[PDB]
Amino acid sequence: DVRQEELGAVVDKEMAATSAAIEDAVRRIEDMMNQARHASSGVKLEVNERILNSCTDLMKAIRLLVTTSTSLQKEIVESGRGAATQQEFYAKNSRWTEGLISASKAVGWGATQLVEAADKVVLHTGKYEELIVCSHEIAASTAQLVAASKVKANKHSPHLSRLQECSRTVNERAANVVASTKSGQEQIEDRDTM
């Protein structure tokens, strides 16, 4: 249970860790594009490359959402702390800060989960179904990060509206990972049955 007086430090570190985890996810997924070309070939390799790329576009959209989330948090703090330090502001609004830490943590974990599901199905024997669920779950975690950020916000900068748009974009990208996995799966099972 995080000390109230160090909540500012912990949320700053958590947002930073979530962003690093998202960057690690982009690198791992992109590295699988090269590894796939060695685990498979043909229609399977082609659809897997498309799926890995949809996953990469989703992770880049999430990268932007988290960065915008951090920007909105910092403006909320700068605007409301007055003579207090950031630490004091976070401590005084401990509830809000805790929501940020918890929501951020979940996104980080969601990214790690999605990378693992992609790895298992593309390079091993995992199910495409698992990648689809992880796609839905990470989108759910980001919408929660957005709501947790929104609580102490208002129609202000670095735009609450910009963060909300970012969420729509992530949801659209997650839907694309799903459409891409379904499209690809039915393309793989349809080349073999002739």
GROMACS .gro file of C-alpha atoms in nm:
model
  194
    1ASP     CA    1   0.000   0.000   0.000
    2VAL     CA    2   0.169   0.317  -0.127
    3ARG     CA    3   0.249   0.589   0.125
    4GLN     CA    4   0.036   0.892   0.063
    5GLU     CA    5   0.338   1.121   0.084
    6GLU     CA    6   0.515   0.939  -0.199
    7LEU     CA    7   0.216   0.896  -0.435
    8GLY     CA    8   0.352   1.161  -0.673
    9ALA     CA    9   0.682   0.974  -0.712
   10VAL     CA   10   0.502   0.642  -0.762
   11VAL     CA   11   0.256   0.769  -1.026
   12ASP     CA   12   0.541   0.943  -1.212
   13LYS     CA   13   0.739   0.617  -1.209
   14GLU     CA   14   0.433   0.413  -1.306
   15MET     CA   15   0.340   0.626  -1.607
   16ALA     CA   16   0.702   0.608  -1.719
   17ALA     CA   17   0.709   0.232  -1.673
   18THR     CA   18   0.385   0.190  -1.872
   19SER     CA   19   0.533   0.393  -2.160
   20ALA     CA   20   0.855   0.185  -2.151
   21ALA     CA   21   0.647  -0.135  -2.152
   22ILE     CA   22   0.455  -0.008  -2.457
   23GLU     CA   23   0.787   0.069  -2.634
   24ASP     CA   24   0.912  -0.275  -2.541
   25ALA     CA   25   0.591  -0.417  -2.690
   26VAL     CA   26   0.644  -0.233  -3.021
   27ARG     CA   27   1.002  -0.368  -3.042
   28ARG     CA   28   0.905  -0.722  -2.955
   29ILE     CA   29   0.617  -0.733  -3.203
   30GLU     CA   30   0.832  -0.581  -3.477
   31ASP     CA   31   1.109  -0.836  -3.402
   32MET     CA   32   0.854  -1.114  -3.450
   33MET     CA   33   0.804  -0.990  -3.809
   34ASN     CA   34   1.161  -1.105  -3.875
   35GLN     CA   35   1.132  -1.422  -3.672
   36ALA     CA   36   0.805  -1.525  -3.840
   37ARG     CA   37   0.985  -1.532  -4.173
   38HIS     CA   38   1.181  -1.819  -4.013
   39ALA     CA   39   0.908  -2.011  -3.833
   40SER     CA   40   0.660  -2.025  -4.121
   41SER     CA   41   0.603  -1.936  -4.485
   42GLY     CA   42   0.327  -1.904  -4.743
   43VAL     CA   43  -0.024  -1.785  -4.665
   44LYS     CA   44   0.042  -1.844  -4.293
   45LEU     CA   45   0.347  -1.613  -4.294
   46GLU     CA   46   0.162  -1.350  -4.496
   47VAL     CA   47  -0.142  -1.332  -4.269
   48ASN     CA   48   0.081  -1.340  -3.960
   49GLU     CA   49   0.278  -1.040  -4.090
   50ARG     CA   50  -0.046  -0.851  -4.138
   51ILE     CA   51  -0.164  -0.941  -3.788
   52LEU     CA   52   0.173  -0.836  -3.635
   53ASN     CA   53   0.142  -0.508  -3.817
   54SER     CA   54  -0.212  -0.448  -3.695
   55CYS     CA   55  -0.079  -0.516  -3.341
   56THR     CA   56   0.204  -0.272  -3.396
   57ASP     CA   57  -0.037   0.003  -3.512
   58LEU     CA   58  -0.248  -0.065  -3.201
   59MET     CA   59   0.057  -0.037  -2.973
   60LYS     CA   60   0.161   0.292  -3.136
   61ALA     CA   61  -0.189   0.429  -3.086
   62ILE     CA   62  -0.167   0.321  -2.717
   63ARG     CA   63   0.175   0.488  -2.690
   64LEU     CA   64   0.013   0.815  -2.789
   65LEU     CA   65  -0.284   0.772  -2.557
   66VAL     CA   66  -0.060   0.712  -2.251
   67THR     CA   67   0.163   1.009  -2.338
   68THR     CA   68  -0.149   1.227  -2.378
   69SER     CA   69  -0.277   1.082  -2.050
   70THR     CA   70   0.044   1.186  -1.874
   71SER     CA   71   0.023   1.532  -2.031
   72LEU     CA   72  -0.337   1.577  -1.909
   73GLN     CA   73  -0.239   1.463  -1.558
   74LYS     CA   74   0.048   1.710  -1.543
   75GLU     CA   75  -0.173   1.999  -1.653
   76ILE     CA   76  -0.435   1.908  -1.394
   77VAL     CA   77  -0.162   1.909  -1.131
   78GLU     CA   78  -0.003   2.234  -1.251
   79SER     CA   79  -0.342   2.400  -1.264
   80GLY     CA   80  -0.461   2.287  -0.923
   81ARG     CA   81  -0.152   2.269  -0.700
   82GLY     CA   82  -0.123   2.644  -0.654
   83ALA     CA   83   0.142   2.706  -0.391
   84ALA     CA   84   0.173   2.332  -0.321
   85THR     CA   85   0.432   2.100  -0.476
   86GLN     CA   86   0.330   1.822  -0.713
   87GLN     CA   87   0.384   1.575  -0.426
   88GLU     CA   88   0.140   1.769  -0.208
   89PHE     CA   89  -0.118   1.790  -0.482
   90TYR     CA   90  -0.102   1.414  -0.547
   91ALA     CA   91  -0.110   1.343  -0.173
   92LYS     CA   92  -0.413   1.567  -0.121
   93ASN     CA   93  -0.593   1.398  -0.410
   94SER     CA   94  -0.472   1.052  -0.310
   95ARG     CA   95  -0.787   0.884  -0.439
   96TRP     CA   96  -0.738   1.023  -0.791
   97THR     CA   97  -0.366   0.946  -0.783
   98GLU     CA   98  -0.433   0.590  -0.678
   99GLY     CA   99  -0.677   0.548  -0.967
  100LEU     CA  100  -0.404   0.664  -1.207
  101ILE     CA  101  -0.149   0.418  -1.068
  102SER     CA  102  -0.393   0.127  -1.082
  103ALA     CA  103  -0.518   0.211  -1.434
  104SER     CA  104  -0.162   0.266  -1.565
  105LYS     CA  105  -0.045  -0.062  -1.417
  106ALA     CA  106  -0.323  -0.247  -1.597
  107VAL     CA  107  -0.228  -0.099  -1.937
  108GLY     CA  108   0.132  -0.206  -1.888
  109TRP     CA  109   0.020  -0.556  -1.804
  110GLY     CA  110  -0.226  -0.548  -2.099
  111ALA     CA  111   0.060  -0.468  -2.335
  112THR     CA  112   0.271  -0.754  -2.198
  113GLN     CA  113  -0.026  -0.992  -2.232
  114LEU     CA  114  -0.088  -0.894  -2.594
  115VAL     CA  115   0.279  -0.943  -2.691
  116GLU     CA  116   0.278  -1.290  -2.535
  117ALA     CA  117  -0.043  -1.394  -2.714
  118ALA     CA  118   0.095  -1.268  -3.046
  119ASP     CA  119   0.422  -1.455  -2.985
  120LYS     CA  120   0.248  -1.779  -2.900
  121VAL     CA  121   0.024  -1.789  -3.202
  122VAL     CA  122   0.272  -1.653  -3.454
  123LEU     CA  123   0.583  -1.841  -3.347
  124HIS     CA  124   0.433  -2.134  -3.155
  125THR     CA  125   0.102  -2.315  -3.108
  126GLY     CA  126  -0.104  -2.051  -2.934
  127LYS     CA  127  -0.460  -1.965  -3.034
  128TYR     CA  128  -0.569  -1.672  -3.244
  129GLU     CA  129  -0.861  -1.653  -3.004
  130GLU     CA  130  -0.625  -1.553  -2.723
  131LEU     CA  131  -0.484  -1.265  -2.929
  132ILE     CA  132  -0.841  -1.140  -2.992
  133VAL     CA  133  -0.930  -1.139  -2.618
  134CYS     CA  134  -0.605  -0.965  -2.525
  135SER     CA  135  -0.686  -0.703  -2.786
  136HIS     CA  136  -1.022  -0.641  -2.623
  137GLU     CA  137  -0.867  -0.636  -2.278
  138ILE     CA  138  -0.593  -0.383  -2.353
  139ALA     CA  139  -0.853  -0.151  -2.510
  140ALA     CA  140  -1.059  -0.189  -2.193
  141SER     CA  141  -0.756  -0.099  -1.979
  142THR     CA  142  -0.679   0.216  -2.181
  143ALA     CA  143  -1.039   0.341  -2.164
  144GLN     CA  144  -1.001   0.298  -1.785
  145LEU     CA  145  -0.678   0.497  -1.786
  146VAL     CA  146  -0.862   0.769  -1.975
  147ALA     CA  147  -1.152   0.774  -1.727
  148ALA     CA  148  -0.917   0.776  -1.426
  149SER     CA  149  -0.738   1.074  -1.581
  150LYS     CA  150  -1.067   1.248  -1.665
  151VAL     CA  151  -1.205   1.247  -1.309
  152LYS     CA  152  -1.018   1.557  -1.189
  153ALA     CA  153  -1.019   1.706  -1.538
  154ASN     CA  154  -1.242   1.935  -1.740
  155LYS     CA  155  -1.260   2.065  -2.098
  156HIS     CA  156  -0.892   2.169  -2.070
  157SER     CA  157  -0.538   2.111  -2.202
  158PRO     CA  158  -0.335   1.922  -2.302
  159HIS     CA  159  -0.692   1.866  -2.415
  160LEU     CA  160  -0.924   1.628  -2.238
  161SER     CA  161  -1.081   1.605  -2.584
  162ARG     CA  162  -0.750   1.499  -2.736
  163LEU     CA  163  -0.717   1.218  -2.484
  164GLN     CA  164  -1.074   1.108  -2.560
  165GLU     CA  165  -1.004   1.105  -2.934
  166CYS     CA  166  -0.691   0.899  -2.865
  167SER     CA  167  -0.913   0.646  -2.692
  168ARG     CA  168  -1.145   0.622  -2.993
  169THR     CA  169  -0.840   0.568  -3.212
  170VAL     CA  170  -0.711   0.288  -2.987
  171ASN     CA  171  -1.054   0.123  -2.990
  172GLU     CA  172  -1.057   0.139  -3.370
  173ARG     CA  173  -0.711  -0.014  -3.382
  174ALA     CA  174  -0.805  -0.293  -3.147
  175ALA     CA  175  -1.107  -0.367  -3.365
  176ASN     CA  176  -0.864  -0.382  -3.662
  177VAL     CA  177  -0.645  -0.637  -3.486
  178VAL     CA  178  -0.956  -0.844  -3.440
  179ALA     CA  179  -1.076  -0.805  -3.801
  180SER     CA  180  -0.725  -0.881  -3.919
  181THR     CA  181  -0.694  -1.197  -3.710
  182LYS     CA  182  -1.035  -1.324  -3.831
  183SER     CA  183  -0.960  -1.234  -4.193
  184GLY     CA  184  -0.623  -1.408  -4.176
  185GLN     CA  185  -0.751  -1.716  -3.995
  186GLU     CA  186  -1.022  -1.780  -4.257
  187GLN     CA  187  -0.758  -1.727  -4.526
  188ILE     CA  188  -0.536  -1.995  -4.378
  189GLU     CA  189  -0.810  -2.253  -4.332
  190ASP     CA  190  -0.944  -2.174  -4.682
  191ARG     CA  191  -0.623  -2.249  -4.875
  192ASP     CA  192  -0.595  -2.600  -4.732
  193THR     CA  193  -0.945  -2.736  -4.792
  194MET     CA  194  -0.929  -2.733  -5.174
   0.00000   0.00000   0.00000
